[PDB]
Curated annotation (Swiss-Prot), chain A:
One annotated GO molecular function: protein dimerization activity
InterPro entries: DNA-dir_RNA_pol_30-40kDasu_CS, DNA-dir_RNA_pol_insert, DNA-dir_RNA_pol_RpoA/D/Rpb3, RBP11-like, RNAP_Rpo3/Rpb3/RPAC1, RNApol_insert_sf, Rpo3/RPB3_RNA_Pol_subunit
Domain of life: Eukaryota
Family the UniProt entry places it in: Belongs to the archaeal Rpo3/eukaryotic RPB3 RNA polymerase subunit family.
Modification sites for Phosphoserine: 123, 243
Keyword line: DNA-directed RNA polymerase, Nucleus, Phosphoprotein, Transcription
Full protein name: DNA-directed RNA polymerase II subunit RPB3
Primary gene name: POLR2C
PANTHER family, alphabetized: DNA-DIRECTED RNA POLYMERASE (PTHR11800), DNA-DIRECTED RNA POLYMERASE II SUBUNIT RPB3 (PTHR11800:SF2)
From Swiss-Prot, chain B:
Span of the signal peptide: none
Family per similarity comment: Belongs to the archaeal Rpo10/eukaryotic RPB10 RNA polymerase subunit family.
GO CC terms in record: cytosol; nucleoplasm; nucleus; RNA polymerase I complex; RNA polymerase II, core complex; RNA polymerase III complex
GO biological process, one term: transcription by RNA polymerase II
Compartments where located: Nucleus; Nucleus, Nucleolus
Organism classification: Eukaryota, Metazoa, Chordata, Craniata, Vertebrata
NCBIfam families assigned: PRK04016.1 (NF003089)
Species per Swiss-Prot/TrEMBL record: Homo sapiens (Human)
Binding sites annotated in the UniProt record for Zn(2+): 7, 10, 44-45
GO MF term list: DNA binding; DNA-directed RNA polymerase activity; zinc ion binding
This protein's UniProt keywords: DNA-directed RNA polymerase, Metal-binding, Nucleus, Transcription, Zinc
Domain of life (superkingdom): Eukaryota
Description of how the protein assembles with itself and partners: Component of the RNA polymerase I (Pol I), RNA polymerase II (Pol II) and RNA polymerase III (Pol III) complexes consisting of at least 13, 12 and 17 subunits, respectively. Pol I complex consists of a ten-subunit catalytic core composed of POLR1A/RPA1, POLR1B/RPA2, POLR1C/RPAC1, POLR1D/RPAC2, POLR1H/RPA12, POLR2E/RPABC1, POLR2F/RPABC2, POLR2H/RPABC3, POLR2K/RPABC4 and POLR2L/RPABC5; a mobile stalk subunit POLR1F/RPA43 protruding from the core and additional subunits homologous to general transcription factors POLR1E/RPA49 and POLR1G/RPA34.
This protein's name: DNA-directed RNA polymerases I, II, and III subunit RPABC5
UniProtKB/Swiss-Prot annotation, chain C:
One GO BP: transcription by RNA polymerase II
Organism of this sequence: Homo sapiens (Human)
Gene coding for it: POLR2J
Protein name per its UniProtKB record: DNA-directed RNA polymerase II subunit RPB11-a
Keyword annotations of the record: Acetylation, DNA-directed RNA polymerase, Nucleus, Transcription
Subunit comment: Component of the RNA polymerase II (Pol II) core complex consisting of 12 subunits: a ten-subunit catalytic core composed of POLR2A/RPB1, POLR2B/RPB2, POLR2C/RPB3, POLR2I/RPB9, POLR2J/RPB11, POLR2E/RPABC1, POLR2F/RPABC2, POLR2H/RPABC3, POLR2K/RPABC4 and POLR2L/RPABC5 and a mobile stalk composed of two subunits POLR2D/RPB4 and POLR2G/RPB7, protruding from the core and functioning primarily in transcription initiation. Part of Pol II(G) complex, in which Pol II core associates with an additional subunit POLR2M; unlike conventional Pol II, Pol II(G) functions as a transcriptional repressor.
Short name of one Pfam family: RNA_pol_L_2
Role this protein plays: Core component of RNA polymerase II (Pol II), a DNA-dependent RNA polymerase which synthesizes mRNA precursors and many functional non-coding RNAs using the four ribonucleoside triphosphates as substrates.
Swiss-Prot record, chain D:
Lineage: Eukaryota, Metazoa, Chordata, Craniata, Vertebrata
Domain of life (superkingdom): Eukaryota
Residues annotated with N-acetylalanine modification: 1
Primary location: nucleus
Protein name (record): DNA-directed RNA polymerases I, II, and III subunit RPABC3
Gene name linked to the record: POLR2H
Length: 257, 67, 115, 148
């Protein structure tokens, strides 16, 4: 009735991808960790946009939606920041938001590409993943775009703009031993990247005593958070949800008894 | 209209890869090779640039309301 | 025009209790837990952890409606073992597993970087 | 006690007509001693069965076999009565038909016991002497272990 002792083996570690294997844990635990990668990892993104001038061929909400999807480097100050709901200040403050300024006007005949590089943050650390550049809008001569934007702290449950990761690869039981999927013709299915069987055989022999374990992960960051920090933040957030639920359950038990 | 950020399915940044894709197509590369050069592996990401039609370039042929 | 706010899936509004404990009168030593603003991420993990307990006779969770944000976890245990105790033990178990996993993952990251 | 039928069976066929189900095969068996025909559906991927292998099939009203009803409810924590765990494959079902060879005046000399184990059906044909413990709509435990 006690906790399994999971182990981690990290195979690939880049600035964009972390490929790791978690052993000796439940399938539900692994899937919840995967869901938190997408849903419950806090990340800073633009949520409040106010436009002073927009002469571009894209309307105001178009460019606002494009701005909100621009990832911002939230590696360390995301934990320091507080949700605007939990912040004591009205509107926005530096302890709950990062302000952005955009001012682009096309004066030359050549087309003007408004990029994330033209986003200017009041913080030196929260940068739109520009150490190419994400295109915001193209400006013909005589077209102008000036706006102010505030970046809030949020997670992917509220909006996909706060999804810190690209496609999270998840896999368990590479050679089909638990038969959680049944192949009508196993011979015509490509072998997994983590398959451990020979070319001659298609799937592993059925294991009645087996259970899902050794879950293969490949979390691809979108640049807002380092891909290793995504897993750390996910584990911390899942543990925080469990701890809050435990506190409220303890209060409920004491009150009802 | 314009190259979308954040590929619909997975969420990879593809808004910074349209001009590079156009250049790779213009110089040597085929579309499949150009997509690989940009690191667009998942076909959800590949269809973002492969099926993109850049109408904003046609929209820039119209004079602005204010000179 | 009837779009619910996007924060309505995790934010508790005024007067909404996070967890409600109600006994199940059909079976002895059985309880029903209603978690508000919670989804499969916590429900599935709690159900899986409760099944590891030999003293838990029944452990299941469900979302009654996807458009609503609520979890019902039904826990039945052996005599002289309250389902609330099993729930608390499962949560502590999950926290202990997550802490160990986080420590080991940090050690693995340190080993991979320059090592 | 609480044991309704016990015999050593030998598998004669696995799928005489065809493999109707991937995980379920139909064992056509004949017993020594009592000389009784057996048709049984057995989960194969869980309990593989080959052709011409002996197994001891025991049909009992209760696993405890000391004379207490099982009440038909699942409880993993019932090790206390020391149930019959001497078998590799244990099934739990209900007999739904007892067909016979009786004809008006004369009594039935051969009986057929039809049992559904959650959907895996069993027919046990033989002389009425050893099948008289079966009653329709009664819970039955199937206990089979392979023999060397
Ligand atoms: Zn504030
Ligand atoms: Zn994609």
């Amino acid at each position: 009735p006690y906790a399994n002792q999971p182990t981690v083996r990290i195979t690939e570690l880049t600035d964009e991808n972390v490929k790791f294997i978690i052993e000796n844990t439940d399938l539900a635990v692994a899937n919840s960790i995967r869901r938190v990668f997408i849903a419950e990892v806090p990340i800073i993104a633009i949520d409040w946009v106010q436009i002073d001038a927009n002469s571009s061929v894209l309307h105001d909400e178009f460019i606002a939606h494009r701005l909100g999807l621009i990832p911002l480097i939230s590696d360390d100050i995301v934990d320091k920041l507080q949700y605007s709901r939990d912040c004591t200040c009205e509107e926005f403050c530096p302890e709950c938001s990062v302000e952005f300024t955009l001012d682009v006007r096309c004066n030359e005949d050549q087309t003007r590409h408004v990029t994330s590089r033209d986003l200017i943050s009041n913080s030196p650390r929260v940068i739109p993943v520009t150490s190419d550049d994400i295109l915001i809008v193209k400006l013909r001569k005589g077209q102008e775009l000036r706006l102010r934007a505030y970046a809030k702290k949020g997670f992917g449950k509220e909006h996909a703009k706060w999804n810190p990761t690209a496609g999270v690869a998840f896999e368990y039981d590479p050679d089909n031993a638990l038969r959680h999927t049944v192949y009508p013709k196993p011979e015509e299915w490509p072998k997994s990247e983590y398959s451990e069987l020979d070319e001659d055989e298609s799937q592993a022999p059925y294991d009645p005593n087996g259970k899902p374990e050794r879950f293969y992960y490949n979390v691809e960051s979108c640049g807002s958070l380092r891909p290793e920090t995504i897993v750390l933040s996910a584990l911390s957030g899942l543990k925080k949800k469990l701890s809050d639920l435990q506190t409220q359950l303890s209060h409920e038990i004491q009150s009802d008894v | 209209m314009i190259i979308p950020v954040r590929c619909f399915t997975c969420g990879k940044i593809v808004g910074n890869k349209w001009e590079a894709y156009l250049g790779l197509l213009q110089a040597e590369y085929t579309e499949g090779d150009a997509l690989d050069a940009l690191g667009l592996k998942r076909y959800c990401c590949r269809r973002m640039l492969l099926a993109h039609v850049d109408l904003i370039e046609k929209l820039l042929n119209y004079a602005p309301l204010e000179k | 025009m009837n779009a619910p706010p996007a924060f309505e899936s995790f934010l508790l509004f005024e007067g909404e209790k996070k967890i409600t404990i109600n006994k199940d009168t059909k079976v002895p030593n059985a309880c029903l837990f209603t978690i508000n603003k919670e989804d499969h991420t916590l429900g599935n993990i709690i159900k899986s952890q409760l099944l590891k307990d030999p003293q838990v006779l029944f452990a299941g969770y469900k979302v009654p409606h996807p458009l609503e944000h609520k979890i019902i976890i039904r826990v039945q245990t052996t005599p002289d073992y309250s389902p609330q105790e099993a729930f608390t033990n499962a949560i502590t178990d999950l926290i202990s597993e997550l802490s160990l996993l986080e420590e080991r993952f940090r050690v693995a990251i340190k080993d991979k970087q320059e090592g | 006690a609480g044991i309704l039928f016990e015999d050593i069976f030998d598998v004669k066929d696995i799928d005489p007509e065809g493999k109707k189900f991937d995980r379920v095969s139909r064992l056509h068996c004949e017993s020594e001693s009592f000389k009784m025909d057996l048709i049984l559906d057995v989960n194969i991927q869980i309990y593989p069965v080959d052709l011409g292998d002996k197994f001891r099939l025991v049909i009992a009203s209760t696993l405890y076999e000391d004379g207490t009803l099982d009440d038909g409810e699942y409880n993993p924590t019932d090790d206390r009565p020391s149930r019959a765990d001497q078998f590799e494959y244990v099934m739990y079902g209900k007999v739904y038909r007892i067909e016979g060879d009786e004809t008006s005046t004369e009594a039935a000399t051969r009986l057929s016991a039809y049992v559904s184990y959650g959907g895996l059906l069993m027919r046990l044909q033989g002389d009425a002497n050893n099948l008289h413990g079966f009653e329709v709509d009664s819970r039955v435990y199937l206990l089979m272990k392979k023999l060397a």
